Design a protein around this ligand. Structure first.
Ligand SMILES: [Cl-]
Ligand SMILES: [Cl-]
Length: 316
């Protein structure tokens, strides 16, 4: 029996595509413990007798579990498929705990009919964009990326000054920000109503906005996009670790990565995957990944309370 802590979104497809084949191949039963990142993480951190074997989380939350001492540092000699991960995703392998099994990216979604040229992240600060952009809130997946983007503009890495210069650049961006968001649905309507001309948004969000306003384009600055990952960890209290390792190795396999890309719109971390143009629609795939930047969540989580305070003080 393998107990899996996960979101369980599109549960039927998820079971059909990922868990059932594994269960049948290994002659075992899979049980899901579902909920959102925060509730699942909170429960396992406070439960002395957790029965969870493996845990799926966004990297930001996974790092909090690592810090809490809930997850095992992994023996990658038992996960040979990790050798097939792209160089950016391998940053999670180097970290030593659970590896990324999927990735996502951001871009600048732009309505080109406004005739305002936007090519780089720094262009978001142009005076012509007064009252015309939306950015992700600090509490969302891409909040940290937004602070790092501001750090690039300032020319001071957040590890040098804990982000103070980045926050001064965020103050400077204020006249152009219509709102900080949290919902993808929110952006589609803002573009449809002409409330914004540009938004820093995820690959998934570009797809949603495009359905409402097909003329929008997705600009990826030459300096590089920012990636975020979801990872799989083995719980330290697990009594089924050999099977847990087999499962992670399976989740990273070329076949499972291809199946989940197609069935669940999960961008692959396995560089050997064969996918068509229609299949990679709205996924993050290709050269974009090679030039991308990754975030150090060990560092970011250590300054998150400060960042949230600073962000709210500045943006409201
Ligand atoms: Cl638990
Ligand atoms: Cl994350």
């Amino acid at each position: 029996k393998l107990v899996v802590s996960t979101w369980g979104l599109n549960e039927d497809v998820l079971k059909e595509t990922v868990f059932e084949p594994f269960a049948k191949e290994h002659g075992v039963e899979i049980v899901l413990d579902i909920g959102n990142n925060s509730e699942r993480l909170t429960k396992m951190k406070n439960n002395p007798n957790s029965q969870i074997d493996i845990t799926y989380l966004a990297e930001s939350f996974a790092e909090q579990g690592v810090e809490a001492g809930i997850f095992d540092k992994l023996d990658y000699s038992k996960i040979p498929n990790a050798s097939e991960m792209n160089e950016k995703a391998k940053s999670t392998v180097e970290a030593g705990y659970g590896p990324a099994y999927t990735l996502n990216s951001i871009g600048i979604v732009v309505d080109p009919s406004a005739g305002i040229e936007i090519n780089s992240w720094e262009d978001l600060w142009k005076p012509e964009l007064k009252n015309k952009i939306a950015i992700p809130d600090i509490t969302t997946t891409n909040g940290p990326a937004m602070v790092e983007i501001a750090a690039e503009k300032a020319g001071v890495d957040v590890k040098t000054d804990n982000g103070e210069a980045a926050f001064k650049e965020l103050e400077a961006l204020k006249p152009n920000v219509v709102k900080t968001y949290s919902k993808s649905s929110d952006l589609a309507n803002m573009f449809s109503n002409g409330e914004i001309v540009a938004a820093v948004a995820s690959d998934f969000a570009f797809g949603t906005i495009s359905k409402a306003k097909p003329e929008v384009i997705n600009v990826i600055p030459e300096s590089g996009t920012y990636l975020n990952f979801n990872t799989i960890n083995i719980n330290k209290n697990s009594k089924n670790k050999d099977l847990a390792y087999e499962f992670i190795n399976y989740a990273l396999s070329k076949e499972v990565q291809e199946k989940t890309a197609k069935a669940l719109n999960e961008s692959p971390v396995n560089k050997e995957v064969k996918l068509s143009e229609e299949e990679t629609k709205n996924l993050t795939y290709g050269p974009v990944v090679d030039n991308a930047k990754v975030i150090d969540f060990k560092f970011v989580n250590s300054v998150m309370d400060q960042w949230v305070n600073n962000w709210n003080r500045i943006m409201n």
